[PDB]
Amino acid sequence: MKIRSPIVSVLGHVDHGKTTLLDHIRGSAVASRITQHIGATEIPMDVIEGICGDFLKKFSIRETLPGLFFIDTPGHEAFTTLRKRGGALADLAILIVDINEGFKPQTQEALNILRMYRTPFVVAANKIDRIHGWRVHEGRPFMETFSKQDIQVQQKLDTKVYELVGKLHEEGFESERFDRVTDFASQVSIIPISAITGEGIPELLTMLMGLAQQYLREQLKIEEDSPARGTILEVKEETGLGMTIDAVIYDGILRKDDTIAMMTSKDVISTRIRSLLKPRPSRKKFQKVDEVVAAAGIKIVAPGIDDVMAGSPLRVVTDPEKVREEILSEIEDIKIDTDEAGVVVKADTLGSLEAVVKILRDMYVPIKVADIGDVSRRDVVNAGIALQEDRVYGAIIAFNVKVIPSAAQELKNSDIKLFQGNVIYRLMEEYEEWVRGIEEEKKKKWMEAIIKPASIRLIPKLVFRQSKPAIGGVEVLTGVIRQGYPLMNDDGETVGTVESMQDKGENLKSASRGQKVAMAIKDAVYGKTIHEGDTLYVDIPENHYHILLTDEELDLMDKIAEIKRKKNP
Ligand SMILES: Nc1nc2c(ncn2[C@@H]2O[C@H](COP(=O)(O)OP(=O)(O)NP(=O)(O)O)[C@@H](O)[C@H]2O)c(=O)[nH]1
Ligand SMILES: [Mg+2]
Protein backbone atom coordinates (compact mmCIF):
# COMPACT_ATOMS: atom_id res chain seq x y z
CA MET A 1 0.00 0.00 0.00
CA LYS A 2 0.94 3.65 -0.41
CA ILE A 3 -0.43 7.15 0.06
CA ARG A 4 -1.23 8.80 -3.28
CA SER A 5 -1.46 12.46 -4.28
CA PRO A 6 -4.77 14.16 -3.52
CA ILE A 7 -6.81 14.76 -6.68
CA VAL A 8 -7.81 18.43 -7.02
CA SER A 9 -10.45 19.39 -9.61
CA VAL A 10 -10.60 22.96 -11.07
CA LEU A 11 -14.17 24.13 -11.62
CA GLY A 12 -15.59 27.44 -12.80
CA HIS A 13 -17.40 29.41 -15.49
CA VAL A 14 -16.32 29.36 -19.16
CA ASP A 15 -13.01 31.17 -19.58
CA HIS A 16 -12.58 32.22 -15.94
CA GLY A 17 -9.26 30.37 -16.25
CA LYS A 18 -9.46 26.66 -15.35
CA THR A 19 -6.98 25.45 -18.00
CA THR A 20 -4.65 28.40 -17.80
CA LEU A 21 -4.21 27.83 -14.07
CA LEU A 22 -3.13 24.21 -14.54
CA ASP A 23 -0.91 25.12 -17.48
CA HIS A 24 0.92 27.68 -15.29
CA ILE A 25 1.29 25.19 -12.44
CA ARG A 26 2.74 22.68 -14.92
CA GLY A 27 5.12 25.32 -16.23
CA SER A 28 6.42 26.05 -12.73
CA ALA A 29 7.20 22.37 -12.14
CA VAL A 30 8.87 21.90 -15.54
CA ALA A 31 11.12 24.96 -15.29
CA SER A 32 12.25 23.95 -11.78
CA ARG A 33 13.09 20.27 -12.12
CA ILE A 34 8.01 15.90 -14.49
CA THR A 35 5.58 13.16 -15.48
CA GLN A 36 3.04 14.45 -18.03
CA HIS A 37 -0.65 13.44 -17.91
CA ILE A 38 -3.62 13.68 -20.24
CA GLY A 39 -6.06 16.34 -19.01
CA ALA A 40 -4.25 16.61 -15.66
CA THR A 41 -1.15 18.15 -14.08
CA GLU A 42 0.97 16.48 -11.42
CA ILE A 43 3.01 18.75 -9.20
CA PRO A 44 5.60 16.97 -6.96
CA MET A 45 5.90 17.81 -3.28
CA ASP A 46 9.41 19.25 -3.64
CA VAL A 47 8.14 21.64 -6.29
CA ILE A 48 5.30 22.68 -3.96
CA GLU A 49 7.69 23.16 -1.02
CA GLY A 50 9.80 25.23 -3.39
CA ILE A 51 6.93 27.55 -4.36
CA CYS A 52 5.47 27.78 -0.85
CA GLY A 53 8.03 29.00 1.62
CA ASP A 54 8.03 28.08 5.26
CA PHE A 55 4.27 28.77 5.06
CA LEU A 56 4.00 25.00 4.63
CA LYS A 57 5.94 23.89 7.71
CA LYS A 58 2.80 23.95 9.88
CA PHE A 59 1.33 21.01 7.90
CA SER A 60 2.72 17.62 8.92
CA ILE A 61 0.95 15.91 5.97
CA ARG A 62 3.54 17.61 3.74
CA GLU A 63 5.96 14.83 4.76
CA THR A 64 3.74 11.99 3.56
CA LEU A 65 2.37 13.12 0.20
CA PRO A 66 3.91 12.58 -3.24
CA GLY A 67 2.44 15.93 -4.27
CA LEU A 68 -0.81 17.17 -5.75
CA PHE A 69 -2.61 15.90 -8.82
CA PHE A 70 -4.79 18.46 -10.61
CA ILE A 71 -7.55 17.62 -13.05
CA ASP A 72 -9.13 20.07 -15.48
CA THR A 73 -12.93 20.09 -15.92
CA PRO A 74 -13.25 17.92 -19.09
CA GLY A 75 -15.30 18.85 -22.19
CA HIS A 76 -17.32 22.07 -21.99
CA GLU A 77 -18.00 22.72 -18.28
CA ALA A 78 -18.68 19.00 -17.70
CA PHE A 79 -18.20 19.09 -13.91
CA THR A 80 -20.50 16.13 -13.32
CA THR A 81 -18.26 13.78 -15.26
CA LEU A 82 -15.66 13.99 -12.42
CA ARG A 83 -17.16 11.17 -10.34
CA LYS A 84 -16.37 7.69 -9.07
CA ARG A 85 -18.21 4.97 -7.17
CA GLY A 86 -17.82 6.31 -3.67
CA GLY A 87 -18.61 9.88 -4.68
CA ALA A 88 -16.58 12.62 -6.37
CA LEU A 89 -13.43 11.71 -8.21
CA ALA A 90 -11.62 14.66 -6.62
CA ASP A 91 -10.54 14.78 -2.97
CA LEU A 92 -10.36 18.58 -3.12
CA ALA A 93 -11.49 21.34 -5.48
CA ILE A 94 -10.57 24.81 -6.62
CA LEU A 95 -13.59 26.92 -7.59
CA ILE A 96 -12.11 29.56 -9.92
CA VAL A 97 -13.94 32.83 -10.56
CA ASP A 98 -12.90 35.92 -12.51
CA ILE A 99 -12.42 38.38 -9.62
CA ASN A 100 -13.56 41.11 -12.03
CA GLU A 101 -16.70 39.37 -13.34
CA GLY A 102 -17.74 37.60 -10.13
CA PHE A 103 -20.21 34.65 -10.05
CA LYS A 104 -21.71 33.54 -13.38
CA PRO A 105 -24.18 30.65 -14.07
CA GLN A 106 -21.53 27.91 -14.18
CA THR A 107 -19.94 29.23 -10.98
CA GLN A 108 -23.24 28.54 -9.22
CA GLU A 109 -23.51 25.12 -10.88
CA ALA A 110 -20.00 24.16 -9.73
CA LEU A 111 -20.67 25.44 -6.20
CA ASN A 112 -23.88 23.34 -5.89
CA ILE A 113 -22.07 20.19 -7.06
CA LEU A 114 -19.24 20.84 -4.60
CA ARG A 115 -21.77 21.42 -1.79
CA MET A 116 -23.67 18.27 -2.83
CA TYR A 117 -20.63 15.93 -2.83
CA ARG A 118 -19.25 17.62 0.28
CA THR A 119 -15.89 18.19 -1.32
CA PRO A 120 -13.62 20.65 0.53
CA PHE A 121 -12.63 23.54 -1.73
CA VAL A 122 -10.94 26.95 -1.84
CA VAL A 123 -12.07 29.80 -4.13
CA ALA A 124 -9.40 31.21 -6.45
CA ALA A 125 -10.40 34.79 -7.35
CA ASN A 126 -8.60 34.89 -10.70
CA LYS A 127 -7.33 37.62 -13.01
CA ILE A 128 -6.22 40.11 -10.34
CA ASP A 129 -3.68 41.34 -12.93
CA ARG A 130 -6.60 42.96 -14.78
CA ILE A 131 -7.75 45.12 -11.85
CA HIS A 132 -7.23 48.71 -13.09
CA GLY A 133 -3.89 50.02 -11.87
CA TRP A 134 -2.50 46.67 -10.78
CA ARG A 135 1.24 46.34 -11.17
CA VAL A 136 2.49 42.82 -11.88
CA HIS A 137 5.17 41.17 -9.75
CA GLU A 138 5.75 37.76 -11.46
CA GLY A 139 5.03 34.56 -9.51
CA ARG A 140 5.20 36.32 -6.16
CA PRO A 141 2.99 35.34 -3.20
CA PHE A 142 -0.25 37.31 -3.05
CA MET A 143 0.70 39.02 0.24
CA GLU A 144 3.86 40.32 -1.41
CA THR A 145 2.44 41.70 -4.67
CA PHE A 146 -0.64 43.11 -2.94
CA SER A 147 1.46 45.02 -0.36
CA LYS A 148 3.17 46.77 -3.28
CA GLN A 149 -0.04 47.96 -4.91
CA ASP A 150 -1.31 51.54 -4.45
CA ILE A 151 -3.77 51.81 -1.56
CA GLN A 152 -6.76 52.44 -3.81
CA VAL A 153 -5.93 49.42 -5.95
CA GLN A 154 -5.76 47.33 -2.78
CA GLN A 155 -9.14 48.78 -1.81
CA LYS A 156 -10.69 47.91 -5.14
CA LEU A 157 -9.44 44.32 -4.84
CA ASP A 158 -10.87 43.82 -1.36
CA THR A 159 -14.17 45.25 -2.59
CA LYS A 160 -14.43 42.54 -5.29
CA VAL A 161 -13.48 39.94 -2.70
CA TYR A 162 -16.22 41.09 -0.32
CA GLU A 163 -18.76 40.77 -3.12
CA LEU A 164 -17.67 37.11 -3.41
CA VAL A 165 -18.09 36.72 0.36
CA GLY A 166 -21.54 38.22 0.08
CA LYS A 167 -22.53 35.79 -2.69
CA LEU A 168 -21.04 32.76 -0.90
CA HIS A 169 -22.90 33.81 2.29
CA GLU A 170 -26.18 33.93 0.32
CA GLU A 171 -25.23 30.37 -0.74
CA GLY A 172 -24.83 29.17 2.82
CA PHE A 173 -21.04 29.37 2.87
CA GLU A 174 -19.15 31.67 5.23
CA SER A 175 -15.83 32.84 3.83
CA GLU A 176 -13.03 35.36 3.84
CA ARG A 177 -9.79 36.22 2.04
CA PHE A 178 -7.48 33.31 3.13
CA ASP A 179 -5.47 35.46 5.52
CA ARG A 180 -8.53 36.83 7.32
CA VAL A 181 -10.14 33.41 7.82
CA THR A 182 -10.85 32.41 11.47
CA ASP A 183 -11.98 28.73 11.38
CA PHE A 184 -10.32 27.03 8.40
CA ALA A 185 -12.63 24.09 8.89
CA SER A 186 -15.86 26.02 8.39
CA GLN A 187 -14.96 29.12 6.33
CA VAL A 188 -14.08 28.90 2.64
CA SER A 189 -10.69 30.49 2.00
CA ILE A 190 -10.59 32.88 -0.93
CA ILE A 191 -7.21 33.34 -2.61
CA PRO A 192 -6.70 36.23 -5.06
CA ILE A 193 -4.52 35.10 -7.94
CA SER A 194 -3.43 35.57 -11.52
CA ALA A 195 -3.28 32.38 -13.59
CA ILE A 196 -1.30 34.20 -16.30
CA THR A 197 1.08 35.81 -13.89
CA GLY A 198 1.90 33.47 -11.05
CA GLU A 199 0.66 35.95 -8.46
CA GLY A 200 -1.04 34.32 -5.47
CA ILE A 201 -0.33 30.81 -6.67
CA PRO A 202 1.94 30.25 -3.64
CA GLU A 203 -0.94 30.82 -1.16
CA LEU A 204 -3.29 28.80 -3.38
CA LEU A 205 -1.13 25.70 -2.99
CA THR A 206 -0.62 26.43 0.72
CA MET A 207 -4.38 26.51 1.26
CA LEU A 208 -4.83 23.26 -0.73
CA MET A 209 -2.18 21.68 1.51
CA GLY A 210 -4.17 23.07 4.44
CA LEU A 211 -7.29 21.28 3.22
CA ALA A 212 -5.31 18.03 2.84
CA GLN A 213 -4.04 18.49 6.42
CA GLN A 214 -7.64 18.95 7.61
CA TYR A 215 -9.61 16.32 5.67
CA LEU A 216 -7.61 13.68 3.88
CA ARG A 217 -6.42 10.46 5.45
CA GLU A 218 -7.81 7.05 4.59
CA GLN A 219 -9.09 8.21 1.16
CA LEU A 220 -5.49 8.66 -0.06
CA LYS A 221 -4.61 5.01 0.49
CA ILE A 222 -4.09 2.96 -2.65
CA GLU A 223 -2.88 -0.50 -3.51
CA GLU A 224 -0.26 0.13 -6.20
CA ASP A 225 -0.42 -3.51 -7.27
CA SER A 226 -4.20 -3.86 -7.52
CA PRO A 227 -5.99 -3.88 -10.90
CA ALA A 228 -6.53 -0.21 -11.81
CA ARG A 229 -9.83 1.54 -11.08
CA GLY A 230 -10.59 4.84 -12.80
CA THR A 231 -13.10 7.02 -14.57
CA ILE A 232 -13.47 7.86 -18.27
CA LEU A 233 -13.39 11.62 -18.81
CA GLU A 234 -13.71 11.79 -22.59
CA VAL A 235 -14.16 9.49 -25.55
CA LYS A 236 -12.98 11.17 -28.70
CA GLU A 237 -11.27 10.77 -32.04
CA GLU A 238 -7.57 11.57 -32.55
CA THR A 239 -6.02 11.82 -36.05
CA GLY A 240 -4.29 8.59 -37.11
CA LEU A 241 -5.77 6.67 -34.19
CA GLY A 242 -9.40 5.96 -34.01
CA MET A 243 -11.73 6.71 -31.20
CA THR A 244 -9.70 7.16 -28.06
CA ILE A 245 -10.43 7.15 -24.27
CA ASP A 246 -9.13 9.82 -21.87
CA ALA A 247 -9.18 8.59 -18.29
CA VAL A 248 -8.07 9.21 -14.74
CA ILE A 249 -6.92 6.26 -12.64
CA TYR A 250 -7.42 6.79 -8.88
CA ASP A 251 -6.25 3.39 -7.54
CA GLY A 252 -4.06 0.56 -8.76
CA ILE A 253 -1.98 0.05 -11.87
CA LEU A 254 -2.99 0.01 -15.52
CA ARG A 255 -0.85 -1.90 -17.97
CA LYS A 256 -0.44 -1.74 -21.72
CA ASP A 257 -1.61 -5.33 -22.23
CA ASP A 258 -4.54 -5.04 -19.83
CA THR A 259 -8.17 -5.85 -20.57
CA ILE A 260 -10.51 -3.10 -19.30
CA ALA A 261 -14.24 -2.94 -18.74
CA MET A 262 -16.53 0.07 -19.14
CA MET A 263 -20.13 0.90 -19.94
CA THR A 264 -21.50 1.75 -23.37
CA SER A 265 -24.91 3.27 -24.05
CA LYS A 266 -26.16 -0.34 -24.34
CA ASP A 267 -24.24 -2.64 -21.98
CA VAL A 268 -21.01 -3.31 -20.11
CA ILE A 269 -18.10 -4.35 -22.36
CA SER A 270 -14.40 -5.07 -22.09
CA THR A 271 -11.56 -4.54 -24.57
CA ARG A 272 -7.87 -5.33 -24.82
CA ILE A 273 -5.61 -2.27 -24.74
CA ARG A 274 -3.29 -1.64 -27.72
CA SER A 275 -1.44 1.26 -26.03
CA LEU A 276 -1.30 3.86 -23.27
CA LEU A 277 -0.42 7.37 -24.35
CA LYS A 278 0.69 10.44 -22.45
CA PRO A 279 1.41 13.92 -23.79
CA ARG A 280 4.97 14.15 -25.09
CA PRO A 281 7.02 16.95 -23.41
CA SER A 282 10.21 12.38 -33.84
CA ARG A 283 7.28 14.78 -34.28
CA LYS A 284 4.87 12.60 -32.32
CA LYS A 285 2.33 14.32 -30.06
CA PHE A 286 2.04 11.32 -27.73
CA GLN A 287 4.56 9.06 -26.01
CA LYS A 288 3.82 5.38 -25.27
CA VAL A 289 4.21 4.00 -21.78
CA ASP A 290 4.01 0.41 -20.56
CA GLU A 291 1.95 1.26 -17.47
CA VAL A 292 0.74 4.01 -15.14
CA VAL A 293 -0.06 3.74 -11.43
CA ALA A 294 -2.93 5.31 -9.51
CA ALA A 295 -2.76 8.99 -9.63
CA ALA A 296 -2.65 9.26 -13.42
CA GLY A 297 -4.38 10.81 -16.45
CA ILE A 298 -3.97 8.66 -19.55
CA LYS A 299 -5.18 8.29 -23.11
CA ILE A 300 -6.12 4.74 -24.09
CA VAL A 301 -6.20 3.18 -27.54
CA ALA A 302 -8.34 0.04 -27.81
CA PRO A 303 -10.81 -1.42 -30.36
CA GLY A 304 -14.19 -1.97 -28.82
CA ILE A 305 -14.96 1.63 -28.07
CA ASP A 306 -16.84 4.27 -30.09
CA ASP A 307 -19.95 3.97 -27.98
CA VAL A 308 -18.20 4.10 -24.61
CA MET A 309 -19.89 6.66 -22.34
CA ALA A 310 -18.13 9.66 -20.78
CA GLY A 311 -18.30 9.28 -17.00
CA SER A 312 -18.18 5.44 -17.13
CA PRO A 313 -16.28 3.55 -14.44
CA LEU A 314 -13.04 2.06 -15.83
CA ARG A 315 -11.78 -1.27 -14.46
CA VAL A 316 -8.94 -3.58 -15.45
CA VAL A 317 -10.26 -7.14 -15.59
CA THR A 318 -8.85 -10.12 -13.67
CA ASP A 319 -12.26 -11.79 -13.11
CA PRO A 320 -14.77 -10.88 -15.90
CA GLU A 321 -18.05 -11.84 -14.25
CA LYS A 322 -16.93 -10.30 -11.00
CA VAL A 323 -16.14 -7.01 -12.78
CA ARG A 324 -19.28 -6.93 -14.96
CA GLU A 325 -21.40 -7.45 -11.85
CA GLU A 326 -19.55 -4.73 -9.99
CA ILE A 327 -20.03 -2.21 -12.79
CA LEU A 328 -23.69 -3.18 -13.22
CA SER A 329 -24.26 -2.79 -9.49
CA GLU A 330 -22.64 0.64 -9.66
CA ILE A 331 -25.00 1.64 -12.44
CA GLU A 332 -28.11 0.26 -10.74
CA ASP A 333 -27.48 2.11 -7.50
CA ILE A 334 -27.92 5.34 -9.46
CA LYS A 335 -30.59 4.32 -12.02
CA ILE A 336 -33.84 4.19 -9.96
CA ASP A 337 -36.87 2.46 -11.50
CA THR A 338 -39.91 1.92 -9.27
CA ASP A 339 -43.60 2.67 -9.73
CA GLU A 340 -44.12 4.49 -6.46
CA ALA A 341 -44.36 8.29 -6.32
CA GLY A 342 -43.45 10.12 -9.52
CA VAL A 343 -40.99 12.33 -11.47
CA VAL A 344 -39.00 11.21 -14.53
CA VAL A 345 -35.31 12.13 -14.86
CA LYS A 346 -32.98 11.67 -17.85
CA ALA A 347 -29.35 12.74 -18.13
CA ASP A 348 -26.47 12.30 -20.59
CA THR A 349 -23.94 10.66 -18.24
CA LEU A 350 -23.92 8.46 -15.10
CA GLY A 351 -22.34 11.39 -13.26
CA SER A 352 -24.85 14.00 -14.44
CA LEU A 353 -27.63 11.51 -13.64
CA GLU A 354 -26.28 11.01 -10.14
CA ALA A 355 -25.96 14.75 -9.56
CA VAL A 356 -29.60 15.50 -10.55
CA VAL A 357 -30.90 12.56 -8.52
CA LYS A 358 -28.93 13.85 -5.57
CA ILE A 359 -30.18 17.44 -5.87
CA LEU A 360 -33.79 16.28 -6.32
CA ARG A 361 -33.51 14.15 -3.18
CA ASP A 362 -32.28 17.07 -1.14
CA MET A 363 -35.40 18.82 -2.46
CA TYR A 364 -37.48 15.91 -1.19
CA VAL A 365 -38.83 15.34 -4.71
CA PRO A 366 -39.62 11.63 -5.26
CA ILE A 367 -38.40 9.98 -8.47
CA LYS A 368 -40.07 7.22 -10.45
CA VAL A 369 -37.53 7.08 -13.30
CA ALA A 370 -33.82 8.01 -13.42
CA ASP A 371 -31.92 6.89 -16.51
CA ILE A 372 -29.43 7.87 -19.17
CA GLY A 373 -30.26 8.92 -22.73
CA ASP A 374 -32.67 10.96 -24.82
CA VAL A 375 -36.30 11.26 -23.76
CA SER A 376 -38.05 8.15 -25.12
CA ARG A 377 -41.69 7.31 -25.75
CA ARG A 378 -41.40 5.04 -22.71
CA ASP A 379 -40.24 7.95 -20.54
CA VAL A 380 -43.31 9.98 -21.51
CA VAL A 381 -45.56 7.03 -20.68
CA ASN A 382 -44.12 6.72 -17.17
CA ALA A 383 -44.47 10.44 -16.67
CA GLY A 384 -48.11 10.07 -17.69
CA ILE A 385 -48.59 7.37 -15.09
CA ALA A 386 -47.08 9.84 -12.65
CA LEU A 387 -49.14 12.74 -14.00
CA GLN A 388 -51.96 10.98 -12.17
CA GLU A 389 -51.82 11.62 -8.43
CA ASP A 390 -50.31 15.09 -8.21
CA ARG A 391 -49.89 16.66 -11.63
CA VAL A 392 -46.72 17.77 -9.82
CA TYR A 393 -45.00 14.50 -10.72
CA GLY A 394 -46.21 14.66 -14.31
CA ALA A 395 -42.86 16.06 -15.44
CA ILE A 396 -39.69 15.01 -17.26
CA ILE A 397 -36.38 16.56 -16.20
CA ALA A 398 -33.89 16.11 -19.06
CA PHE A 399 -30.32 17.23 -18.48
CA ASN A 400 -28.24 17.84 -21.61
CA VAL A 401 -30.17 15.23 -23.54
CA LYS A 402 -32.26 15.36 -26.72
CA VAL A 403 -35.86 14.25 -27.18
CA ILE A 404 -36.51 11.33 -29.53
CA PRO A 405 -39.08 12.31 -32.23
CA SER A 406 -41.51 9.51 -31.37
CA ALA A 407 -41.36 10.97 -27.86
CA ALA A 408 -41.84 14.62 -28.82
CA GLN A 409 -44.93 13.94 -30.96
CA GLU A 410 -46.50 11.55 -28.46
CA LEU A 411 -45.68 14.32 -25.98
CA LYS A 412 -47.57 17.12 -27.78
CA ASN A 413 -50.44 16.26 -25.45
CA SER A 414 -50.55 18.71 -22.54
CA ASP A 415 -50.48 17.79 -18.84
CA ILE A 416 -46.88 16.53 -19.12
CA LYS A 417 -44.34 19.24 -18.37
CA LEU A 418 -40.84 19.02 -19.79
CA PHE A 419 -37.73 20.74 -18.49
CA GLN A 420 -34.65 20.60 -20.70
CA GLY A 421 -31.34 22.26 -20.18
CA ASN A 422 -27.65 21.75 -19.54
CA VAL A 423 -27.63 23.67 -16.23
CA ILE A 424 -28.87 21.64 -13.27
CA TYR A 425 -29.75 24.43 -10.80
CA ARG A 426 -31.69 26.22 -13.56
CA LEU A 427 -33.77 23.06 -14.12
CA MET A 428 -34.61 22.88 -10.41
CA GLU A 429 -35.63 26.54 -10.10
CA GLU A 430 -37.85 25.98 -13.14
CA TYR A 431 -39.46 22.85 -11.71
CA GLU A 432 -40.08 24.59 -8.38
CA GLU A 433 -41.47 27.76 -9.94
CA TRP A 434 -43.80 25.37 -11.77
CA VAL A 435 -44.92 23.55 -8.64
CA ARG A 436 -45.72 26.87 -6.89
CA GLY A 437 -48.10 27.78 -9.69
CA ILE A 438 -49.77 24.38 -9.89
CA GLU A 439 -50.33 24.57 -6.13
CA GLU A 440 -51.87 28.05 -6.35
CA GLU A 441 -54.15 26.95 -9.18
CA LYS A 442 -55.36 24.00 -7.10
CA LYS A 443 -55.87 26.20 -4.04
CA LYS A 444 -57.72 28.72 -6.23
CA LYS A 445 -60.16 26.08 -7.48
CA TRP A 446 -60.32 25.18 -3.80
CA MET A 447 -62.13 28.42 -2.94
CA GLU A 448 -64.70 28.18 -5.74
CA ALA A 449 -66.29 25.26 -3.87
CA ILE A 450 -66.38 27.01 -0.49
CA ILE A 451 -69.22 29.13 0.86
CA LYS A 452 -68.02 32.53 2.07
CA PRO A 453 -69.45 34.99 4.63
CA ALA A 454 -72.08 37.48 3.48
CA SER A 455 -74.88 39.63 4.86
CA ILE A 456 -78.02 41.15 3.30
CA ARG A 457 -80.91 43.39 4.34
CA LEU A 458 -84.46 43.20 3.03
CA ILE A 459 -85.39 46.70 1.92
CA PRO A 460 -88.82 47.44 3.36
CA LYS A 461 -91.67 48.27 0.98
CA LEU A 462 -90.06 46.35 -1.91
CA VAL A 463 -91.85 43.01 -1.89
CA PHE A 464 -92.62 41.69 -5.37
CA ARG A 465 -93.66 38.19 -4.36
CA GLN A 466 -94.47 36.75 -0.94
CA SER A 467 -94.55 32.95 -1.29
CA LYS A 468 -93.08 30.33 -3.62
CA PRO A 469 -90.16 32.24 -4.92
CA ALA A 470 -90.05 35.00 -2.33
CA ILE A 471 -88.93 38.11 -4.24
CA GLY A 472 -87.94 41.42 -2.72
CA GLY A 473 -85.55 44.33 -2.88
CA VAL A 474 -82.30 43.50 -1.11
CA GLU A 475 -79.15 45.38 -0.14
CA VAL A 476 -75.98 43.35 0.38
CA LEU A 477 -74.73 44.53 3.76
CA THR A 478 -71.32 42.85 3.71
CA GLY A 479 -69.49 40.18 1.76
CA VAL A 480 -70.44 38.66 -1.57
CA ILE A 481 -73.75 36.81 -1.57
CA ARG A 482 -74.09 34.23 -4.31
CA GLN A 483 -76.71 32.31 -6.29
CA GLY A 484 -77.33 29.19 -4.25
CA TYR A 485 -76.00 30.39 -0.90
CA PRO A 486 -78.00 29.20 2.15
CA LEU A 487 -79.55 31.91 4.33
CA MET A 488 -80.49 31.93 8.00
CA ASN A 489 -82.12 34.14 10.62
CA ASP A 490 -80.60 36.14 13.48
CA ASP A 491 -81.14 32.87 15.33
CA GLY A 492 -79.31 30.54 12.97
CA GLU A 493 -82.65 29.35 11.58
CA THR A 494 -82.52 28.41 7.87
CA VAL A 495 -84.79 30.73 5.89
CA GLY A 496 -83.97 29.59 2.38
CA THR A 497 -81.56 29.73 -0.53
CA VAL A 498 -80.67 32.58 -2.91
CA GLU A 499 -82.37 31.52 -6.15
CA SER A 500 -81.72 34.54 -8.40
CA MET A 501 -80.56 38.14 -8.35
CA GLN A 502 -81.27 41.11 -10.56
CA ASP A 503 -79.47 44.44 -10.69
CA LYS A 504 -81.92 46.76 -12.43
CA GLY A 505 -82.17 44.78 -15.64
CA GLU A 506 -79.09 42.58 -15.28
CA ASN A 507 -79.19 39.03 -13.90
CA LEU A 508 -76.39 38.44 -11.37
CA LYS A 509 -74.58 35.31 -10.22
CA SER A 510 -72.99 37.31 -7.41
CA ALA A 511 -73.60 40.61 -5.61
CA SER A 512 -70.98 42.72 -3.79
CA ARG A 513 -71.48 45.14 -0.88
CA GLY A 514 -74.02 47.99 -1.17
CA GLN A 515 -75.21 46.53 -4.50
CA LYS A 516 -79.02 46.51 -4.01
CA VAL A 517 -80.95 44.11 -6.19
CA ALA A 518 -84.25 42.31 -6.57
CA MET A 519 -83.60 38.91 -5.04
CA ALA A 520 -85.54 35.67 -5.31
CA ILE A 521 -85.29 33.55 -2.15
CA LYS A 522 -86.46 29.96 -2.59
CA ASP A 523 -88.27 28.27 0.29
CA ALA A 524 -88.94 31.57 2.07
CA VAL A 525 -92.08 33.61 2.65
CA TYR A 526 -92.53 37.24 3.69
CA GLY A 527 -94.59 37.81 6.82
CA LYS A 528 -93.75 34.42 8.28
CA THR A 529 -90.27 33.02 7.64
CA ILE A 530 -88.73 36.27 6.43
CA HIS A 531 -89.61 39.89 7.23
CA GLU A 532 -89.15 43.34 5.70
CA GLY A 533 -86.12 45.03 7.21
CA ASP A 534 -84.63 41.84 8.61
CA THR A 535 -80.94 41.16 8.16
CA LEU A 536 -80.21 37.69 6.87
CA TYR A 537 -76.89 35.90 7.03
CA VAL A 538 -75.24 33.15 5.04
CA ASP A 539 -75.37 29.78 6.75
CA ILE A 540 -71.82 28.57 6.20
CA PRO A 541 -71.32 24.81 6.78
CA GLU A 542 -69.40 23.71 9.89
CA ASN A 543 -66.26 22.46 8.15
CA HIS A 544 -66.47 25.00 5.32
CA TYR A 545 -66.05 27.39 8.24
CA HIS A 546 -62.96 25.75 9.76
CA ILE A 547 -61.31 26.73 6.50
CA LEU A 548 -61.34 30.40 7.55
CA LEU A 549 -61.55 39.11 4.35
CA THR A 550 -62.10 42.73 5.36
CA ASP A 551 -62.75 44.28 8.78
CA GLU A 552 -66.47 44.14 7.99
CA GLU A 553 -66.28 40.48 6.98
CA LEU A 554 -64.27 39.64 10.09
CA ASP A 555 -66.79 41.25 12.42
CA LEU A 556 -69.60 39.48 10.57
CA MET A 557 -67.50 36.29 10.57
CA ASP A 558 -67.87 36.44 14.35
CA LYS A 559 -71.41 37.82 14.12
CA ILE A 560 -72.33 34.58 12.36
CA ALA A 561 -70.46 32.67 15.07
CA GLU A 562 -72.52 34.17 17.90
CA ILE A 563 -75.78 33.42 16.08
CA LYS A 564 -74.77 29.79 15.52
CA ARG A 565 -73.32 29.50 19.03
CA LYS A 566 -76.74 30.42 20.42
CA LYS A 567 -78.27 26.99 19.80
CA ASN A 568 -74.88 25.22 19.71
CA PRO A 569 -71.43 24.97 21.30
N1 LIG B 1 -5.41 38.56 -17.88
C1 LIG B 1 -5.63 37.29 -17.54
N2 LIG B 1 -6.15 36.42 -18.42
C2 LIG B 1 -6.31 35.14 -17.90
C3 LIG B 1 -6.02 34.69 -16.64
N3 LIG B 1 -6.33 33.34 -16.50
C4 LIG B 1 -6.79 33.06 -17.68
N4 LIG B 1 -6.81 34.08 -18.57
C5 LIG B 1 -7.24 34.19 -19.96
O1 LIG B 1 -8.63 33.92 -20.07
C6 LIG B 1 -8.96 33.17 -21.22
C7 LIG B 1 -9.62 31.82 -20.77
O2 LIG B 1 -8.70 30.96 -20.07
P1 LIG B 1 -9.03 29.42 -20.06
O3 LIG B 1 -7.88 28.93 -19.28
O4 LIG B 1 -9.12 28.77 -21.37
O5 LIG B 1 -10.39 29.26 -19.39
P2 LIG B 1 -11.32 28.04 -19.12
O6 LIG B 1 -12.04 28.35 -17.87
O7 LIG B 1 -10.32 26.90 -18.98
N5 LIG B 1 -12.18 27.66 -20.36
P3 LIG B 1 -13.33 26.75 -20.94
O8 LIG B 1 -14.48 26.64 -19.94
O9 LIG B 1 -13.62 26.97 -22.36
O10 LIG B 1 -12.45 25.51 -20.61
C8 LIG B 1 -7.62 32.99 -21.85
O11 LIG B 1 -7.47 33.92 -22.89
C9 LIG B 1 -6.62 33.18 -20.77
O12 LIG B 1 -5.36 33.56 -21.29
C10 LIG B 1 -5.47 35.63 -15.70
O13 LIG B 1 -5.15 35.41 -14.53
N6 LIG B 1 -5.30 36.93 -16.23
MG1 LIG C 1 -9.65 26.21 -21.58
UniProtKB/Swiss-Prot annotation:
Keyword Transit peptide listed: no
Record keywords, A-Z: GTP-binding, Initiation factor, Nucleotide-binding, Protein biosynthesis
Region listing for G4, in residue ranges: 126-129
Positions of the tr-type G domain: 3-216
Region described as G1: spans on this chain: 12-19
InterPro entries on file: EFTu-like_2 (IPR004161), EFTU-type (IPR029459), P-loop_NTPase (IPR027417), Small_GTP-bd (IPR005225), T_Tr_GTP-bd_dom (IPR000795), TF_aIF-2_arc (IPR004544), TIF_IF2 (IPR015760), TIF_IF2_dom3 (IPR023115)
UniProt entry tagged with the keyword Thylakoid: no
Positions of the UniProt region annotated as G5: 194-196
Region (G3): 72-75
GO cellular component, one term: cytoplasm
HAMAP family given in the database record: IF_2_A
Similarity field: Belongs to the TRAFAC class translation factor GTPase superfamily. Classic translation factor GTPase family. IF-2 subfamily.
Protein name as annotated: Probable translation initiation factor IF-2
Originating organism: Methanothermobacter thermautotrophicus (strain ATCC 29096 / DSM 1053 / JCM 10044 / NBRC 100330 / Delta H) (Methanobacterium thermoautotrophicum)
Lineage, highest ranks first: Archaea, Methanobacteriati, Methanobacteriota, Methanomada group, Methanobacteria
Name of the coding gene: infB
